[PDB]
A paper describes a structure:
The structures of DRD1–Gs complexed with dopamine/LY3154207 and SKF81297/LY3154207 were determined at a global resolution of 3.2 Å and 3.0 Å, respectively. In our structure, the contact pattern of LY3154207 with DRD1 is quite different from that in a previously reported simulation model of LY3154207-bound DRD1.6 The whole LY3154207 molecule lies in the cleft between TM3 and TM4 and right above ICL2 with a boat conformation, which is ~33 Å away from the orthosteric DRD1 pocket when measured at the Cα atoms of D1033.32 and Y131ICL2. The extra benzene group of SKF81297 occupies a small extended binding pocket (EBP) at the extracellular vestibule formed by residues V1003.29, L190ECL2, S188ECL2 and F3137.35, which contributes to its higher affinity to DRD1 than dopamine. Interestingly, the side chain of D187ECL2 points towards polar residues K812.60 and D3147.36 in the SKF81297-bound DRD1 but not in the dopamine-bound DRD1, forming a potential polar interaction network.
Dopamine acts as an essential neurotransmitter whose signaling is conducted through five G protein-coupled receptors (GPCRs), dopamine D1 to D5 receptors (DRD1–DRD5).1 The D1-like receptors, comprising DRD1 and DRD5, primarily couple to the Gs family of G proteins to activate adenylyl cyclase and induce cAMP production. Here, we report two structures of DRD1–Gs complexes activated by the endogenous ligand, dopamine, and a synthetic agonist, SKF81297, both in the presence of LY3154207, respectively.
Numbering used by the authors:
A (entry chain G): 6 to 62
B (entry chain R): 21 to 168, 185 to 240, 264 to 298, 307 to 347
C (entry chain A): 9 to 246
D (entry chain B): 3 to 340
E (entry chain N): 1 to 127
The structure:
């Protein structure tokens, strides 16, 4: 009865996973674009920082 | 007509030697993994010696051969000393590389243990020290001049002594070392071939060629370039041979420094580093 | 400032002390040779190194330090992990050799061992590393083949058309049947190793028993050959 | 009995796939077509941390971007200084085979693991001057593969017996035990709010686990192979993943499906480590073909390549303030790329 | 989601011919080496056969060679196992399994108690 207990745990997990609220992909994409646009200037990797503010140069 | 062709060949040889040695020294300055191994220290030393041949000896002799006389005056004796030192430095480094290679192949566990960078530095020190001892002390003390233009006729004692310590004892060590390496290689090819024939039998010459080809290129280029010059170098004070032919053999000797990066510095890592540094 | 220069000097002094410790550890690390011991549960991999050994038990790994001829070998046995091993095997690319011990007596589980060998050999990260093959429990093979109760031909059809190899050198206390079976198992492993692998790693097959003191010598010889072949290939000879 | 349960599981699976199809109004590429591309990001190796003996398997930064812990397979845990290339600490380890290392947000402790199924914590108070084993955690069966500090109290760890554990450091015992996975759980990345965390495994699925609740909120079945690395987006609403099928995927927690796939035809090699930047616009992916690709997270396009490693780039980390990226490979060298 | 469904099976007479079809969903089929593994009742899992990306390289187990055929259809995205001249002893829960990495030849743990990329199983009984 070891396999059936794991099947019952998989069924109960799928039940918990299915009964959620899922936001649309368009709104999530808009949120990610908002976050990237908002924090664009704060990123040193995206926009190259001058050597004096850069601690590694 | 003939002069311009001779100048072009000499210039191309000097350019080739400079290019190859500069690429090796540059590549090993720039990359850490090449210099992280203790084996490559000697290849660095060989590149430095061949670069010194490329710079301090070959152009001045090229100019003298084109001109037909020695225009540099008092530098000629000093030129001879660099000639004796840098060529000996190249050859002894080859001998050390041979010994290095044997130490790696013969006793690997001892090679990993005992061969410290300090040990490498001691071997490079002994090689360069022996070259300086052979060259600068006799030239400045005029030991090499025969008993009563840059044609310094060598005496019998310095010819035989410099030939033995520069060439013949390193040749003896190199032939003994590569012979033992070829015995080890044959034995390992016999074991690999035995297992491969067992596999092929179960299902129901290239290796030996590669070993012989590599060892033969290493021995052949070195012995072909330097052996006529040292045979004549021994024979000539006792005697005879014209100046131009002896010059030609001396150029073959210096040409070995050109061919040395192609032989010893085309491992996978050196190929990668040359492709990266060249950019092509 | 002076304070920043004192802090930088103190950090540099601690860096020099740590560099000295790392140089001593680098000497110890380069001197020591790592050996990955792999096998099955029915096999006798725990009993390969017999005499002149020290045995250390961590919670997840077994270690075995032995010195052969002033040469330190550290063998690691990974026996406290789950059966899925495709991810932790990546850790062992730095080892000098992988000692694979296979129970040749068990004919039913010999194909599982051959699959394990094929997996280890054909790994992308075990292309450099040479496998030292130990065909353990030879006396059980002798008794099994002589007895005749179990048929090796059933499990392996290729054994019927199989012939004894010419390079094969039998022991004094052996028979032609036992020698056929023994070398047929060796040839199967060598066929898998030779067929698919590159020139960077080779399989060293050795027959060993339950009580055999010579195994440390064999592993010393194999590791010496592995480093010699590595040097020869580096020098473009092989 | 088993057949009925598997049928109901397939019906739930189909219902989840239907919900995910329904929620997919438009892909990220369609919405981000009208976005200014990043173009080319040439980053160079500003400083190289050398003197490792074996391969560098994992690394972790600090919250002040000063110290960085690295772990090697010789039994050394070297706490570095990124700025002055100095080794601030070097920790000799009990087992040589160490597959993880974490730096605490307070900087008090530093954790390692490996094949010895023990999570080892090392103090850095140093009232004597020598670092010591502070506590050893021995409650896993499988190999410890990743560990990450919530605080000095709780540490989340990722074993190879298809489990993840929440450990109390002072107590020494497992507070919580996450048993949902069916494969080797490779790495986990804590969210910034630290309420949730995602864990990639070798079952081609990423799980979103609630720390307090002790169960997995979500399951992400998008990859085709073993999810080697996982990294949250900096807001905590999305997370990227990297697998052996040469693909990085971006998954939304809200949509509960794959927002974007980062795949290139010339790449057949796996992805050992993934780490986002501070903004999240660049996704940095450490590959198996000896370089690192700087994908554009919105445009699904390469921007740059960090081709300075001889061997497989095992680990990749980004500072919290975004200064630089440290990549550690199997050639025993650790590079800082800015 | 990577899912492999095995079709076929059931009780057959010894010597009978049975085709086992494994429907591969949720990945790109061509890139992955695939293989067949069977679990006997009261015995461990055992590798039966394999097939490479192109299909050119094929190997078998000793106990199944010459009477088992493994074919992969890339277009129909299916793995076929043709069984003929079946013996009563090798009755098993046949399983269809996928090697974990693409463009690779190493299949470490396809024969393991818990494995991620494997179907539920098809019972083939020979009596
Ligand atoms: C590398 C060489 C060497 C060459 C020059 C100088 C030293 C001493 C350096 C010191 C430790 C004093 O600083 C040494 C060490 C030691 C000598 O004792 N070694 C050797 O064994 C050479 C060797 C042999 Cl014979 C045989 C097989 C392998 C090898 Cl490698
Ligand atoms: C390791 C270093 C010191 C080696 C240096 C070698 C060269 C540069 C040295 C060593 C011997 C030196 C020569 C010794 C003697 C003389 C004679 C003197 O009337 C002119 C200078 C001259 C010709 C020197 C020039 C420089 C010289 C050639
Ligand atoms: C430097 C050490 C290691 C080796 C030294 C070798 C020396 C001592 C030996 C070897 C060869 C010998 C030379 C052999 C031949 C001749 C020709 C003879 O008409 C005069 C003596 C002379 C020139 C010898 C002088 C001494 C000599 C040079
Ligand atoms: C390695 C170094 C120290 C070896 C040095 C060997 C020296 C000391 C020996 C070996 C051969 C010897 C030479 C042999 C023959 C002659 C000819 C004689 O009419 C003058 C002395 C002279 C020129 C000797 C000088 C000293 C000499 C050169
Ligand atoms: C003092 C010095 C000059 C002595 C040198 C001895 C040399 C010339 C002789 C003696 C024994 C000879 C070796 C004997 C056997 C072999 C194996 C053969 O397959 C290739 C040639 C080779 C490798 C010979 C090379 C040259 C050799 C090493
Ligand atoms: C001065 C330089 C040019 C000398 C170079 C000599 C080289 C090119 C020559 C001399 C010895 C020759 C080898 C002699 C024997 C064989 C065995 C044959 O079945 C394959 C070719 C092979 C391996 C030859 C390859 C070319 C070779 C290695
Ligand atoms: C490669 C080197 C070692 C070869 C050396 C060969 C030596 C031993 C032989 C070959 C030619 C010989 C020379 C031939 C002729 C003469 C003229 C005679 O009135 C004095 C002896 C002398 C000068 C001989 C000395 C020894 C000699 C130089
Ligand atoms: O004795 C030697 C002389 C020479 C060299 C070496 Cl190595 C010797 O051992 C180096 C090679 N270049 C020629 C040089 C030379 C000098 C003056 C006259 C003739 C030749
Ligand atoms: C690295 C350069 C190598 C080649 C060097 C070439 C040097 C050429 C020198 C030519 C000198 C010609 C002098 C002629 C004097 C005259 O008019 O008689
Ligand atoms: C008379 C001229 C003498 C010239 C001698 C040149 C010798 C060069 C040797 C360079 C060795 C460099 C070793 C670097 C050590 C390291 O890895 O850090
Ligand atoms: C590194 C390259 C250096 C090149 C140096 C070139 C020097 C050329 C010198 C030429 C001198 C020509 C003298 C001619 C005298 C005459 O008229 O006979
Ligand atoms: C390897 C080193 C070799 C050294 C060779 C040394 C040779 C010494 C020769 C000495 C000759 C002395 C002649 C003196 C002439 C005089 O002024 O009267
Ligand atoms: C004037 C010199 C006499 C002749 C010397 C010729 C030297 C030829 C050297 C050939 C090197 C070939 C290296 C091949 C390397 C490889 O296997 O890819
Ligand atoms: C790759 C090796 C190239 C070697 C080139 C050697 C060229 C030697 C040239 C010698 C010129 C001698 C001219 C003599 C003229 C005369 O008879 O007076």
């Amino acid at each position: 009865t070891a396999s059936i207990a794991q099947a019952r745990k998989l069924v109960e997990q799928l039940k918990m996973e299915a009964n959620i609220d899922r936001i649309k992909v368009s709104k999530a994409a808009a949120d990610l674009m908002a976050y990237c646009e908002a924090h664009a200037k704060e990123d040193p990797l995206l926009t190259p920082v001058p050597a004096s503010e850069n601690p590694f140069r | 007509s003939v002069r311009i062709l001779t100048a072009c060949f000499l210039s191309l040889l000097i350019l080739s030697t400079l290019l190859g040695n500069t690429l090796v020294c540059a590549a090993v300055i720039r990359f850490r993994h090449l210099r992280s191994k203790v084996t490559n220290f000697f290849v660095i030393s060989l590149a430095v010696s061949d670069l010194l041949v490329a710079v301090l000896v070959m152009p001045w002799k090229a100019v003298a051969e084109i001109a037909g006389f020695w225009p540099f005056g008092s530098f000629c004796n000093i030129w001879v000393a660099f000639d004796i030192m840098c060529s000996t430095a190249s050859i002894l480094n080859l001998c050390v590389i041979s010994v290095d290679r044997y130490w790696a192949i013969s006793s690997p566990f001892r090679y990993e243990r005992k061969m410290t960078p300090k040990a490498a530095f001691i071997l490079i020190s002994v090689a360069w020290t022996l070259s300086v001892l052979i060259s600068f002390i006799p030239v400045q003390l005029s030991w090499h001049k025969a008993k009563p233009n840059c044609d310094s006729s060598l005496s019998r004692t310095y010819a035989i002594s410099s030939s033995v310590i520069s060439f013949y004892i390193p040749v003896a060590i190199m032939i003994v070392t590569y012979t033992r390496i070829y015995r080890i290689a044959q034995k390992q090819i016999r074991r690999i071939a035995a297992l491969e024939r067992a596999a092929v039998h179960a299902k129901n010459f290239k290796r030996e060629t590669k070993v012989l080809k590599t060892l033969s290129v290493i021995m052949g280029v070195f012995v072909c370039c330097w052996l006529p010059f040292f045979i004549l170098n021994c024979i000539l004070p006792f005697c005879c041979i014209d100046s131009n032919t002896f010059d030609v053999f001396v150029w073959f000797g210096w040409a070995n420094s050109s061919l040395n990066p192609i032989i010893y510095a085309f491992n996978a890592d050196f190929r990668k580093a040359f492709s990266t540094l060249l950019g092509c | 400032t002076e304070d920043q220069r004192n802090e930088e000097k103190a950090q540099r002094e601690a860096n020099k002390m740590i560099e000295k410790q790392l140089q001593k550890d680098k000497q110890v690390y380069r001197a020591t040779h790592r050996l990955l011991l792999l096998g099955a549960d029915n096999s006798g991999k725990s009993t390969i190194v017999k005499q002149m050994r020290i045995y250390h038990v961590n919670s997840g790994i077994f270690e075995t330090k032995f010195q052969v001829d002033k040469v330190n070998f550290h063998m690691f046995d990974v026996g406290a992990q789950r059966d899925e091993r495709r991810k932790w095997i990546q850790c062992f690319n730095d080892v000098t050799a992988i000692i694979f011990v296979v129970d040749s007596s068990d004919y039913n589980r010999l194909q599982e061992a051959l699959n394990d060998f094929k997996s280890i050999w054909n790994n992308r990260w075990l292309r450099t590393i040479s496998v030292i093959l130990f065909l353990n429990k030879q006396d059980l093979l002798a008794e099994k083949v002589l007895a005749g109760k179990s048929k090796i031909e059933d499990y392996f059809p290729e054994f019927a058309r199989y012939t004894t190899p010419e390079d094969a050198t039998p022991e004094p206390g052996e028979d032609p049947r036992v020698t056929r079976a023994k070398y047929f198992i060796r040839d199967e492993f060598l066929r898998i190793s030779t067929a698919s692998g590159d020139g960077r790693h080779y399989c060293y097959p050795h027959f060993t028993c339950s009580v055999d003191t010579e195994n440390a010598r064999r592993i010393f010889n194999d590791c010496r050959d592995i480093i010699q072949r590595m040097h020869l290939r580096q020098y473009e000879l092989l | 009995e088993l057949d009925q349960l598997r049928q109901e599981a397939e019906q739930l699976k189909n219902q989840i796939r239907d919900a995910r199809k329904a929620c997919a109004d438009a892909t990220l590429s369609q919405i981000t077509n009208n976005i200014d591309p990043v173009g080319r990001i040439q980053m160079r190796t500003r400083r190289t941390l050398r003197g490792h003996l074996a391969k560098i398997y994992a690394m972790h930064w600090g919250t002040d971007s000063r110290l960085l812990v690295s772990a090697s397979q010789d039994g050394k845990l070297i706490i570095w200084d990124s700025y002055t290339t100095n080794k601030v600490h070097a920790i000799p380890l009990r087992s040589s085979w160490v597959m993880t290392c974490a730096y605490a947000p307070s900087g008090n402790y530093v954790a390692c693991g490996g094949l010895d199924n023990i999570c080892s914590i090392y103090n850095l108070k140093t009232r004597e001057g020598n670092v010591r084993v502070s506590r050893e955690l021995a409650g896993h069966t499988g190999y410890l593969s990743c560990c990450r500090f919530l605080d000095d109290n709780q540490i989340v760890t990722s074993s190879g017996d298809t489990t993840c554990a929440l450990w109390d450091i002072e107590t020494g015992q497992q507070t919580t035990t996450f048993t949902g996975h069916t494969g080797d759980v490779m790495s986990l990345s804590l969210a910034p709010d630290t309420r949730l965390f995602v864990s990639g495994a070798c079952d081609a699925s990423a799980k979103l686990w609630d720390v307090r609740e002790g169960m997995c909120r979500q399951t992400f079945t998008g990859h085709e192979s073993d999810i080697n690395a996982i990294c949250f987006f900096p807001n905590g609403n999305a997370f990227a993943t990297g697998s052996d099928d040469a693909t990085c995927r971006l998954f939304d927690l809200r949509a509960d499906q794959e927002l974007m796939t980062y795949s290139h035809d010339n790449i057949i090699c796996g992805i050992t480590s993934v780490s986002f930047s501070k903004s999240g616009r660049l996704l940095l992916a450490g590959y198996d073909d000896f370089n690192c690709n700087v994908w554009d997270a919105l445009k699904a396009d390469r921007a740059g390549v960090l081709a300075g490693h001889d061997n497989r780039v095992s680990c990749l980390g980004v500072t919290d303030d975004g200064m630089a990226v440290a990549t550690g490979s199997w050639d025993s060298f650790l590079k800082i790329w800015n | 989601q990577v899912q492999l469904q095995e079709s076929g099976g059931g009780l057959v007479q010894p010597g009978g011919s049975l085709r086992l079809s494994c429907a591969a969903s949720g990945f790109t089929f061509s890139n992955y080496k695939m293989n067949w593994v069977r679990q006997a009742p009261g015995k461990g899992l055992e590798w039966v056969s394999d097939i490479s990306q192109s299909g050119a390289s094929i190997s078998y187990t000793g106990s199944v060679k010459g009477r088992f055929t493994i074919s992969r259809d890339n277009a129909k995205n299916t793995l076929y196992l043709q069984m003929n001249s079946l013996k009563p002893e090798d009755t098993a829960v046949y399983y269809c399994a996928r090697c974990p990495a693409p463009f690779t030849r190493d299949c470490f743990d396809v024969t393991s108690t818990t494995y991620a990329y494997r179907g539920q199983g098809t019972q083939v009984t020979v009596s």
